[PDB]
Amino acid sequence: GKELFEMWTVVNPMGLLVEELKKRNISAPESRLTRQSGSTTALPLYFVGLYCDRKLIAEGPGETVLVAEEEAARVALRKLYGFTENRRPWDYSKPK
Amino acid sequence: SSFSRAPQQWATFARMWYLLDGKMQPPGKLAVIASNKLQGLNKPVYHQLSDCGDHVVIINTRHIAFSGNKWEQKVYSSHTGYPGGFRQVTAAQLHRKDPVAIVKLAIYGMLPKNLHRRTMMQRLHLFPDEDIPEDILKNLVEELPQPRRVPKRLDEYTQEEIEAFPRVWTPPDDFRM
Amino acid sequence: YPQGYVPKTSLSSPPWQEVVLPDPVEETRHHAEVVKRVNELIATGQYGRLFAVVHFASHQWKVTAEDLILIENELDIKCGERIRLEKVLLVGADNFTLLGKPLLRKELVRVEATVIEKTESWPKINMKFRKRKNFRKKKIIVNPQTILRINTIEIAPRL
Amino acid sequence: LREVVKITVIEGRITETPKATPDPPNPSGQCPICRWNLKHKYTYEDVLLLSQFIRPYGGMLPRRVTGLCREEHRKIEECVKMAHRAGLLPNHRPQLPEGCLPKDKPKLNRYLTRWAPKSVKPIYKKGHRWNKVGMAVGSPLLKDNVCYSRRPLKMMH
Amino acid sequence: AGGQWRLQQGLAANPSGYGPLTELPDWSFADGRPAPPMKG
Amino acid sequence: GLKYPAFIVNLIKCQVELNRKVLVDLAIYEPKTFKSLAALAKRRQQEGFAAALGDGKEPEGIFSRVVQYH
Amino acid sequence: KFTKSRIPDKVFQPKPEDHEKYGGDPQNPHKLHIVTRIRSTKRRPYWEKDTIKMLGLQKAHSPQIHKNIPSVNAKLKVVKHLIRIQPLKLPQGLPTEETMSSTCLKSTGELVVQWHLKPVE
Amino acid sequence: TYSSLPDDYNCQVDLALTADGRTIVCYHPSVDIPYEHTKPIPQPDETHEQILKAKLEVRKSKQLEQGPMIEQLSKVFYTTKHRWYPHGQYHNRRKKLNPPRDR
Amino acid sequence: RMHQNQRERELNNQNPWTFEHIATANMFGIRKFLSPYDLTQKGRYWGKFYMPKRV
Ligand code: FES
DSSP: OOOHHHHSOOSOHHHHHHHHHHHTTOOOOEEEEEEEEOTTSSSOEEEEEEEETTEEEEEEEESSHHHHHHHHHHHHHHHHHTOOTTSOOOOOOOOO | OOOOHHHHHHHHTOOOEEEEEOTTOOHHHHHHHHHHHHHTTTSTTOOTTSOOOOEEEEEOGGGOEEETTHHHHOEEEEEOSSTTOEEEEEHHHHHHHOSSHHHHHHHHHHSOSSTHHHHHGGGEEEOSSSOOOHHHHHHOOEEOOOSSOOOOOGGGSOHHHHHHSOOOOOOOSSOOO | OOTTOOOOOTTTSOSSOOOOOOOHHHHHHHHHHHHHHHHHHHHHTOOOOOEEEEEETTEEEEEETTOEEEESSOOOOOTTOEEEEOOEEEEEOSSEEEEESSSOOTTTEEEEEEEEEEEEOOOEEEOOOOSSOOSSSOEEEOOEEEEEEEEEEEEOSOO | OEEEEEOOOEEEEEOOOOOOOSSOSSTTOSSHHHHTTOTTOOOTTOHHHHHTTBOTTSOBOOHHHHOOOHHHHHHHHHHHHHHHHTTOOTTOOOOOOSSOOOOOOOOOEEESOOSOGGGOOOOOSOOOSSSOOOOBOSOGGGTTSOOOSSSOOOOBO | OOHHHHHHTTSOSSTTSSSHHHHSOSEEESSSOBOOOOOO | OOOHHHHHHHHHHTTOOOOHHHHHHHHHHOHHHHHHHHHHHHHHHHHHHHHHHSOSSOOOOGGGOOOOBO | OOOOOOOOGGGGSOOHHHHHHHTOOSSSOOOEEEEEEOSOOTTSOHHHHHHHHHTTOOSTTOOEEEEOSHHHHHHHHHTGGGEEEEEOBOTTOSOOTTTGGGOEEOTTSBEESOOOOSBOO | OOOSSOSSSSBOOEEEEOSSSSEEEEEOOBOOOOGGGOEEOOOOOOOHHHHHHHHTOOOSSSSOOHHHHHHHHHHHHTOOGGGGOOOOHHHHHHSOSSOOOOO | OHHHHHHHHHHHOOOSOOHHHHHHHTGGGGGGGOOHHHHHHTTSEETTEEOSSOO
8 A cells, every 4th residue: 555656765756757768768758738727726736748759658636737747757657667556466375 | 546645635626617608598597507516516526524616607697588577576585674674676676786696696595504605605706798807717627508508589590491491371462461 | 291291390309319229230240359359358467456346245345455344243254264255246457347247157256355353343322212211221232243354356268 | 462652643563472382291281380280399489480470560460361270370479479578580670650769778588478578566475385476487378289398397487 | 226127027126135146155165165054 | 418317227227236335436436437337327228218119029129138047 | 983894796896808907817716815015004993903913914015825715805805905916826836845945936926946046048 | 439428538438248148348448638639838937835925915014913814815715704713722622632544 | 968068078088097986995995084975975075065077
């Protein structure tokens, strides 16, 4: 029940993401605003999606565009490293 | 999925902005849609202790329509509290003085009779015409279909449509008209 | 103008719109193709966590691995013992789901659980409504309980 | 169509009129409505049918010219009033004799208005639970129309 | 809900009556040994 | 786009015996699975409508076939 | 004064159309009744309360087996409004000592002598 | 296009029956948002605190008195004023120190 | 004509259920709520009032 970044502290997640994408020779992502609500009020909701080659890789929610954009980076990283929430459960079945 | 705890909670419980158009609609049917969203009964995560309402914006409240002879038969009553302070007014008269009172009164009656009702009414924004402040417009997320279907007038039929409908009788040529 | 023709009017046609269902012959071919794809996904093991709906005791529980369940009666199983839940109504993954009518076949799905604790409930007060109620005309009800931990959910390519 | 012209010397000239579309779907029908199988399937919203029986100034035509039977004549007459009151016939307004102008008041939107708006009294004392006074909606003459609802239409609101 | 339809197909009105869902055993040991019969 | 009575009734006619408590869990926590069930209930409703309007002996719907037990 | 009443005999003489509707041949009459109580005896006269106890119909929605003989039928007529009667049916024959432990009664009124809880296939 | 629900918002539903007819198979892949349906981020001019301070601007009388301050707060968050007043010591001492947490 | 009309109404009535059958056969135990005269009058008379449309 522990999320990755709760056990590992990473500042500037976007910077780490850029380097990782370079290693696999992928283009830098393009940030865009997928969904929006209540922008002018004091309780706004933002969805920001990182698009690569006009193809969606990750989407994240946040209170502000900067916060939401940073959230999208963490979602992307988790998928790359295969530490997603819906990943295969660990295996204690083996008696050996 | 795979969000952090706080953004996940923030997204689920966020409040949405909706738009309704009241031209030629009956006020009662408009209230049913508005009451549903004000309470939050459109969300599968609804609970009476969770304060999950949304904002509703209605326009053209001046152009509502009443079926039958309700304009002349529906009376609104109020009392000042002083002897002789009982006033009864018909629907048409009230609509003349205040262009928003009829729609607001319908929505007020359909909400639950408790303290949260008055918090809900703070999220209801009514405009008598098609003009909205710029800040409110930026907030909107969606528009909802009108409950009633507006019949067409004769002048709005295209020439082809009149031709398509058959003729049922022919007046004798020896008729004055 | 053919016989039994009515000019279009407000009440001429029903408010609802009739629909045309797809033809049976082509649909069966499409059904077989869909089943083939899903079976390959199971065979290649392209899935993550699985969740199942299991009928146990007299209740239905949505379940997943590592979950804790509380049963409000004694079971006759020792602590630390493994069991198999045999009435499963639904198994699902990220991209596909399987529904029984009303139960899935034994081959498809296997769910195993373990007995962790055997306990009793906290005291519950029952006090019937009667004239001259009094404070001592009261009963305390405590029931036995057991706790199960769900261990694994498995599927096999036998659709 | 005969128009009287005053040039005093006056004369009336007859002109041609368009004829009914051929091939009635249900011949042997005595009234025009029956001939086209429209007995119970028209309402106030159907201006295209209703307009055909209307004078240029919104009046109803006499039965002898139209040929409608008594039952259909009453129905069409009632539906026309509701169409006028609902603002569905904008080009059939009354004629202003010399200097009369439309009252220029705001127009309240209506539909399904049984009575003349002028002469209806307000309901000052409404009733209690099952003694409530009812507000009529629609016309009784159209009761037998085809209904696509589970239960009959609610006339009293 | 659905009581009348169930009876038409010959089943019980209440799905908690006779049938496989209710009558069949709810569990068995991981080894394969059958469980003791349920009291109901 | 479904009303509550239509959704619940048609699932029963497909021999699905999920109770109301578990259905709420799927809607909140399994949005894609809930949508799949929504289509299934809608289709069975359409099959019933077709069988009603068409009269005489006609083939029954694909999803309108009832498995039997003995 | 409210008192016991006697039903006219004509009520129990059927008509040809009834035989078609309910599907019972006026010959080869069935032998065993299935009776269930579907209403309550409160607010009913005491004679009806006593008969319901004689016929064993104390619990509602539980079937009881009775003989289709005139003496029993005389009692059933008294409480006709509180009960439902269905004729028994034995498609696979009467149960034997071998099959006594495998019977199961369906809602249709059929006492099958084999119950496997498996799809018919 | 056998599915009776449009496939354009949440997922694509494909429903099939097995040959024996005892199981129903569901295939529901997710739908991604098209690029043509997105907007660019407004990079030219943000912490939520900064938004609040602009909203709760202190202009006149320096720190306002209770009443006027509460009326400002109610407008920003679309509530009534009654929400914002404090309570007495009886209610504050009943409150739990350590309420339970689920996960 | 009135008597002839009454006979016509009884013969052509489309209601399967009539007051007479239910009262005589005590369906529902309806006789708990009725008077002896109801069997004779068959629901056409109530107090001193005659019902002209009751069949
Ligand atoms: S419509 Fe044909 S005579 Fe009445």
